[PDB]
Amino acid sequence: SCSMPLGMQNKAISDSQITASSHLSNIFATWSPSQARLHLQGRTNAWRPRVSSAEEWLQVDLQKTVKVTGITTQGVKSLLSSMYVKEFLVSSSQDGRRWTLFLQDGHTKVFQGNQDSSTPVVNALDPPLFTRYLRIHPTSWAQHIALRLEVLGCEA
């Protein structure tokens, strides 16, 4: 049914394949892009950008052409702060240079994401993407932008 996890949770997608516009790092903590893995626990267990704006993104390089059929998102709780992305855009690319924004009915698609810090939310991509690179662009968030991710799809 072409909807299998492509490797964020299980590390089939390696740390070096995940990058971002920026990330939050100070002398105790780094919320690195490679922490953006679905269901990850332990310390600083999500990606957070250096500052929360609408110009940030999390990028995954799948390293080959994949049929991408969906994206799963999750927030994170840190101390008293419950953080999650409420809405986001998706862009994609074959070369990592030229990006195509995901549309619905000819217009920019706003994906409805999370409404808490721990529940995963699956979003279908219709039409599906045949692509190598994906970016998630947060456009609305609670408290701060934080992301744990899975990408769903299959070979061909």
Swiss-Prot record:
Identify the segment of the full-length protein shown: 1974 to 2129 of 2133
Q: Which cysteines are joined by disulfide bonds?
A: 2-154
Name under which the protein is recorded: Coagulation factor VIII
Describe the function of this protein: Factor VIII, along with calcium and phospholipid, acts as a cofactor for factor IXa when it converts factor X to the activated form, factor Xa.
User: How is this protein organized at the quaternary level?
Assistant: Interacts with vWF. vWF binding is essential for the stabilization of F8 in circulation.
Which compartment or compartments is the protein found in?
Secreted, Extracellular space
Segments forming domain F5/8 type C: 2-154
Its source organism is Sus scrofa (Pig)
Superkingdom, taxonomy of origin:
Eukaryota
